[model samples]
Target: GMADPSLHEAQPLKFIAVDYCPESCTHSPESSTITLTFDHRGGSRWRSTTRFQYGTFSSLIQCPKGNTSGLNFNIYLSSLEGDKSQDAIDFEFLGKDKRIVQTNYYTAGTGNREAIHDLGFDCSDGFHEYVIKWGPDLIQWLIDGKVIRSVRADGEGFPQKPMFLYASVWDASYIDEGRWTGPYVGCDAPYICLYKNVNVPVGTAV
Candidate 1:
């Protein structure tokens, strides 16, 4: 699950649609960036208008800083909301630890697959490059141009449906007794997750 669409405030700035950026406009986010602010009322979320088959997606992201407890900063892909068998790919940052990230995928409604990695640096310190290369049979996660993790499709439990790219900053304290991201300590409200330099090579249709 992600941020509630109804709860998120309007996007203050227009995000470059990476897939269509080169055809008529070069949507290079050189100067453009998305600022997702999470306050006491709610958090922020964004999604691509294009649904993609499989390709490379990347962004430069800086996580929210200072007392991010119970927060989740993420970039992911997923099928439409309310789909019974939603397929998804995830790169999630648990606010409880900036040096770690959790990755997972769900096919055919849900799966128990989850992987956690030590990033060796604090994600909340500043911006870092994050990339996801999803192909016909492989999926890769890269950070700062280096491969961090990857997985192969096996006939089952692998994502097959086309999905829209999404980024969000949300409170996830409701899961597993706040063990996922820690309890929502809102003393430091209005945490912001920054994103820019996005690129998406997509294969899709309207």
Candidate 2:
């Protein structure tokens, strides 16, 4: 059920225990997991201090449960913050449903490439492995070590910038007038996304 997974394997990576919103993100020391909460204080974001050029990244993430309209649970690779020209590869849960995921990429900040895939099960039901394999001319998205989608550069839009691994829980209802993630209902206050076992290549360190 899995394609050639040799390239997806990687050594452990050291991650910095830092986050953007102090109150929104809760780090559990004993379990070594990150929990993002969305509530009146808004959503939370966390990132790796180390940056990597090209490698495999995998994380076990459980999306927030209940009515998640307008929320986004995502684990992605980003070029930088506060830069419009940043490149990014994303595995986003659009908060529209628990049984689907959105995969997309942005090369030089131009991103209209969005595809939705059915997971066949609720992503909010449990932790699932999400993987992104990035190489010189190829990028692939995988779930549970199985290839869900793949792309070749070859003049196609490709993200080539060195990026940091990041994950977040955010409200995306305002983006594009709620076409992508729908409008935030806020019925499920303090929606949480649990993440653990974030692995990248061994050489990335700031």
Candidate 3:
């Protein structure tokens, strides 16, 4: 449960969509609902992705702008499948003019036998955090407050400007093919994915 979801008044921001429900979540009968309430005053737009099977996956959310640049955002994700296809989350950012400026993919805990395996960590079990800090010079991806990946947009083929934030959960069809493992096996009804904390700040450019 959220403590107090109050938008920052000084920022002059408002949240558009905040929903919690489950539908067509193949992993478990349980439904995955995401509840987001935030303030976007620093000249930035935020988008959340819909739940879908992995493999043939895409984002349900859209970027704020195509020409717009300098996007800095962070995401908190929970429970992901671990297989060859490696069920992962994708983030796509569009410019002010609505053009794709940057794209990133993140995977949950996997591989290590000693590490917590199976079902990617139980839903409502414990929430994992994933963040991306994008600026005019660099972009960084963090997991549990640790920098997992980073990139620069100064050279050729680099992101020219800032981007929007989009997220989604899909099945790793390539790996699972049709098998169930990780945090998705032996589960019944009420299958849910809870996104507790989400922050998207604009203008500061960190």
Candidate 4:
């Protein structure tokens, strides 16, 4: 279960979206919904105040609609130590389609491993629960209580450092060859992604 959003203010959670778009992010006190809006200018992002090594991070999300061709809505764990070399685990949705999501991870910030999953239904049609369970021995991605993918932490290229939880919506127009995210459509300005019921259960390091 998720603690109320009001408690996040007193905890180690912060909305950093203002740095990108001054008025792109908003929270609904009554519904506990955090909405990230993107336009021609840019999108929004937020992060946790503290980093953790192992935990179960979950959120209910309703993705944006429109000509979201090259847009990405993501929830992941990442280290802020440096941009070039860091560790990360991702749940990224390529907005070219409403029924597919991508999961990947990085070892020391070098990320190339990518996997795409079919969500069976249009994610933008309604809110759905997405979860990541990361531990010393394994990492699992779940959707609506079902495990979608799992990877063994056999020391090959696992992320071991503590990482901050983050959520964002951004344009991926710079991707080469229109391969990964396709191309961005400027006329599709003002797309909104909604999130609620965020829960993070920190696990003890092994």
Q: Which candidate is the best by lDDT?
A: 2
Ranking by TM-score: 2, 4, 1, 3
Q: Where is model 3 more than 4 Å wrong at Cα?
A: 1-14, 18-125, 174-190, 204-206
By TM-score, who's the top model here?
Answer: 2
Q: Comparing candidate 2 with candidate 3, which one achieves the higher TM-score?
A: 2
Question: Which tens-of-lDDT digit does each residue in 25-140 have in candidate 3?
Answer: 11211323243221121122223332222111111122221112223222322123223424233332211112222234332333221111122322223555545554445556
| Candidate 1 global CA lDDT score | 0.76
Residue 55 C-alpha lDDT in model 3: 13
Residues 107-139, candidate 1, lDDT per residue (tens digit)? Answer: 878967788999989997888989887777898
Error of 4 at 45 (Å): 1.1
Counted clashes in each candidate structure:
0, 0, 30, 1
- Residue-level lDDT tens digits of model 4 in 1-206: 58675633112133333335648888764666788888965887876656777888888899987778888898898876346778889999987887999999988878888999999988888999999888777889999989999999766778878888888888886888666787888576789898887766534322
TM-score of each: 0.83, 0.90, 0.38, 0.86
**lDDT minimum window of 10 residues, candidate 1:** 19-28
Comparing 1 and 2 on lDDT, the stronger one: 2
lDDT of each: 0.76, 0.84, 0.30, 0.79
Query: Which 10 residues in a row give candidate 2 its minimum summed lDDT?
Result: 8-17
Instruction: Candidate 4: count the clashes.
Output: 1
